[PDB]
Structure formats: C-alpha cells, structure tokens
Design a protein around this motif. Structure first.
Motif, PDB file in Angstrom:
ATOM      1  N   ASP A 126       0.875  -1.207   0.000  1.00 10.16           N
ATOM      2  CA  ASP A 126       0.000   0.000   0.000  1.00 10.16           C
ATOM      3  C   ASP A 126       0.891   1.228   0.000  1.00 10.16           C
ATOM      4  O   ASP A 126       1.687   1.389   0.945  1.00 10.16           O
ATOM      5  CB  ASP A 126      -0.954   0.043   1.192  1.00 10.16           C
ATOM      6  CG  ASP A 126      -1.996  -1.057   1.111  1.00 10.16           C
ATOM      7  OD1 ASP A 126      -2.526  -1.277   0.016  1.00 10.16           O
ATOM      8  OD2 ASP A 126      -2.235  -1.709   2.135  1.00 10.16           O
ATOM      9  N   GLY A 127       0.744   2.038  -1.039  1.00  9.07           N
ATOM     10  CA  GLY A 127       1.658   3.153  -1.326  1.00  9.07           C
ATOM     11  C   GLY A 127       0.948   4.483  -1.293  1.00  9.07           C
ATOM     12  O   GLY A 127      -0.215   4.531  -1.713  1.00  9.07           O
ATOM     13  N   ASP A 128       1.641   5.514  -0.810  1.00  6.21           N
ATOM     14  CA  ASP A 128       1.249   6.939  -0.954  1.00  6.21           C
ATOM     15  C   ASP A 128       2.500   7.760  -1.324  1.00  6.21           C
ATOM     16  O   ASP A 128       3.466   7.858  -0.507  1.00  6.21           O
ATOM     17  CB  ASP A 128       0.548   7.422   0.317  1.00  6.21           C
ATOM     18  CG  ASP A 128       0.238   8.899   0.285  1.00  6.21           C
ATOM     19  OD1 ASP A 128       1.021   9.647  -0.332  1.00  6.21           O
ATOM     20  OD2 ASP A 128      -0.778   9.288   0.878  1.00  6.21           O
ATOM     21  N   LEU A 229       4.626   1.953   1.825  1.00  7.40           N
ATOM     22  CA  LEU A 229       5.547   2.940   1.207  1.00  7.40           C
ATOM     23  C   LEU A 229       4.933   4.341   1.290  1.00  7.40           C
ATOM     24  O   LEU A 229       3.690   4.493   1.071  1.00  7.40           O
ATOM     25  CB  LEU A 229       5.782   2.550  -0.251  1.00  7.40           C
ATOM     26  CG  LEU A 229       6.638   3.506  -1.087  1.00  7.40           C
ATOM     27  CD1 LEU A 229       7.388   2.720  -2.159  1.00  7.40           C
ATOM     28  CD2 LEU A 229       5.819   4.632  -1.718  1.00  7.40           C
TER      29      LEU A 229
HETATM   30 NA    NA Z   1       0.781   4.622   3.202  1.00 10.18          NA
END
Ligand code: NA
Ligand SMILES: [Ca+2]
Ligand SMILES: [Ca+2]
Ligand SMILES: [Ca+2]
Ligand SMILES: [Ca+2]
Ligand code: NA
Ligand code: NA
Ligand code: NA
Ligand code: NA
Length: 397
Positions: A126-128, A229
């Motif tokens: 799970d990315g931002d 991330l």
């Molecule tokens: Na995140």
C-alpha cells in the motif's frame, strides 16, 4: 579499424570506472538491533538519455526471539529483468531476478531447510507518494538454490502513479543464493520462519524519497512480503511522477560487443592467462595517471569477484561490462572518464593528449593514426574532442 581503436581504449576506461564504483548491496551486522544494515545505489535509465540514481539505506530487524546469524561484511549482486505479460489488460510488471552472495574471498540454520525447493511468494504493498495512493499485488516463486525469483505484479488501484522500476527494490532477499563458504552469513533465511522487518529510505537524486516498512515472513508454505511505502517531496514533472524512466532496458550483447570487451579484457590481461590480477590492474591504472595501493586494487577486484578467487576471470569481466552498458553512467562518471584523456582540464582532448594516453597505455600510434583517431569523433571539425563529442564515442547502437 580506427573505430574500434576507440571502443578498446573506451571500454578499458569504463572498466576502471566500474571497478571504482559500488554497484552491489553492502550488508553489515547491526548487533545493536540483533539484525543487519544494508546500503546500495540503483541506476534507473531515463527513456531519453541519462540516469536517475536512487541511493538506498536498509534496516532488517527479526520478528521473533529465535537466535539469528549476524554476518561479517559481504554483498549481494542482483540481476533484474522486467517484461510485460501480453495477455494482461491491467498495469503490471513481470519480474525475473537473480540474487547471489559474494565478497568474502576463499579462506546453515534451521531457516535454510525452508528454502531447499521452490517456494510460493505473495507480495502486498500500500503506497502513498505526494498523496497519490496506489496498491500492488504480486505472486510468483523462489528457487533459493539458484537465487531465482519469478513474480507478476498488478496495480490493484488502476494506473500506478510511479514508474514500476522505482518499486522493484521494494516489492524478498531471503532467496539469495549464498555459496557454501558464506552460509553462516545469511541472516534472511536464519530469521525465518517468524520473519524479519525490512525498513528502507530511498533517495532519488534531485527529487523525492520513499520510506518503506515490510513484514517478510512465512504464512503457511507461502513466503509473504507486506509493505507500506510513503513518498514525499517528488517533483510533478521530475523523472518519477513524470514517468520519464525506461521500463524495458536493453539485455542484448551483440556477438560483436562481447568481442569489444575481449579486446579490452586483453589490455589488462597482459599475460593472456584469461584472468586479471591486482598486479595487471595496477599496471594499466598507473599508465593512465591513477596510483592506487595493493589495498584498493583488492577491493576493486572484490567488487566483481564472483568465485572470490581474488582475480577477474574473463567471464566475471564480461558480466561487469554487460552491466555497464545495460545501465547509463552519471555525468560525474563520464567527466571522471573524460579527465583521463583531458589531462589539462581545458575541456578538449588534443591530438597530443590522446598520444600521451595511447602511447603511455602502450601502443605504436604514429602521428598519422592518432589523427585518424581524433577525426573519427571530431564532429564540429575543431581538430580536438570536446565533452559532448566524447559521450558519442561512449554509447551503444
Ligand atoms: Na501509506
Ligand atoms: Ca593475467
Ligand atoms: Ca574471480
Ligand atoms: Ca585538454
Ligand atoms: Ca571538436
Ligand atoms: Na552494531
Ligand atoms: Na526470528
Ligand atoms: Na533506514
Ligand atoms: Na512507512
């Protein structure tokens, strides 16, 4: 015939360029955290020339209390191949990868037993990045026996807002082949089955960074990497958020490019025994300005010394020249290379500076052929070779 007179001397330079750089994954014990630290540089080619660097810093802390193996300083070599599945509508990445421990010269834990065959792998991230959320699912498998991973990654949230390559490092080093003499140095396997935490900070030069945190552990027979991330401070138009990076990258050594490497190989391998010694590598560097210690020569050879026999086997050498045309050098590296010839710093390689290198490097090169050489690269007509004239003499196709 004066053409390859460049390709030879040019590859000899880009070879000493390679031996001087740190392309591997450098691992050291972190007794403090009963775990390990790692650091490496990553080269991302930019589709229209140049390279993006990604300076990686890495912490691994074990999840359970099980005793674990804390290694002496060594490194890993990774060879990534990215492709596409052509049946695949979704935004995806097919990743093949080979991962090998080296860098301890010549003269198992419960965990290793778990990697003896082929193991299913599942990856969930799970990315931002700059607030663009995305998620990624991967499956595939790891024959630890060979250092081989095969994985397919889908972007579960539609379109990935970052180039796939940036995630490769982030998307299971517990599948590295450690040679027999180094098995006591594989922390990754030792930590299994309960797992390790893998924390990284990844600095893209002239752009933002990723902070990653990963649970890598067995769930049943499947090895699982779960990752958060967080990217900050990326540029809207920079290489990452502007998707300006090559996906594919070129894996094709023409018959004839291997032969350019052998012509180079043989400049170092003065006795034609098919290996380069500290003695021989010293000889060539000295005749090119540099003047390094026994110590430096051993550490340079140890950057590419697969078998750990303390020499560059002709094969170990080809492997490294293959890398060095696969991935673009930085402007710093090209300048360092130029300045081997531009022995005054005026920004132009004279007829009389090419002679100084050629004939110090040990070739007949009569004032006729020297000029045939200059003329080869001299596009603007000035009887000298300028820095952009140089970058043409030092590229593929
Ligand atoms: Na995140
Ligand atoms: Ca030799
Ligand atoms: Ca060797
Ligand atoms: Ca000059
Ligand atoms: Ca010129
Ligand atoms: Na420590
Ligand atoms: Na553990
Ligand atoms: Na870190
Ligand atoms: Na994080």
């Amino acid at each position: 015939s004066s053409r390859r007179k460049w390709n030879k001397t040019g590859h000899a330079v880009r070879a000493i360029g390679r031996l001087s750089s740190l392309e591997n994954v450098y691992i050291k014990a972190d007794k403090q955290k009963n775990g390990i630290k790692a650091n490496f540089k990553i080269r991302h080619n930019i589709e229209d020339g140049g390279v993006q660097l990604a300076y990686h810093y890495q912490q691994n802390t074990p999840i359970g209390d099980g005793p674990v193996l804390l290694p002496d300083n060594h490194y890993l070599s990774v060879q990534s191949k990215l492709s596409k599945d052509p049946n695949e509508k979704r935004d995806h990445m097919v990743l093949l990868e080979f991962v090998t421990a080296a860098g301890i010269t010549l003269g198992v834990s419960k965990g290793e037993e778990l990697f003896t065959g082929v193991v299913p792998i599942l990856v969930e991230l799970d990315g931002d990045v700059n607030g663009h959320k995305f998620s990624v699912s991967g499956e595939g498998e790891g024959d630890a026996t060979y250092g081989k991973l095969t994985l397919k990654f889908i972007c579960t949230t539609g379109k990935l807002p970052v180039p796939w390559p940036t995630l490769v490092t982030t998307l299971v080093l517990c599948f590295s082949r450690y040679p027999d003499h180094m098995k006591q140095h594989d922390f990754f396997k030792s930590a299994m089955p309960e797992g390790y935490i893998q924390e990284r900070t990844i600095f893209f030069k002239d752009d933002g960074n990723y902070k990653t945190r990963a649970e890598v552990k067995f769930e049943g027979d499947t090895l699982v990497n779960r990752i958060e991330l967080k990217g900050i401070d990326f540029k809207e138009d920079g290489n990452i958020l502007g998707h300006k990076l090559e996906y594919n990258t070129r894996d094709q050594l023409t018959e004839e490019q291997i032969a350019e490497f052998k012509e180079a190989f043989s400049l170092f391998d003065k006795d034609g025994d098919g290996t380069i010694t500290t003695k021989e590598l010293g000889t060539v560097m000295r005749s090119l300005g540099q003047n390094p210690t026994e110590a430096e020569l051993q550490d340079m050879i140890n950057e590419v010394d697969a078998d750990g026999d303390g020499t560059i086997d002709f094969p170990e050498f080809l492997t490294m020249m293959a890398r060095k045309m696969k991935y673009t050098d930085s402007e710093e590296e090209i300048r360092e290379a130029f300045r081997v010839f531009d022995k005054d710093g005026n920004g132009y390689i004279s007829a009389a500076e090419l002679r100084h290198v050629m004939t110090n490097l040990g070739e007949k090169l009569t004032d006729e052929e020297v000029d045939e050489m200059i003329r080869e690269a001299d596009i603007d007509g000035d009887g000298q070779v300028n820095y952009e004239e140089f970058v043409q003499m030092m590229t593929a196709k």
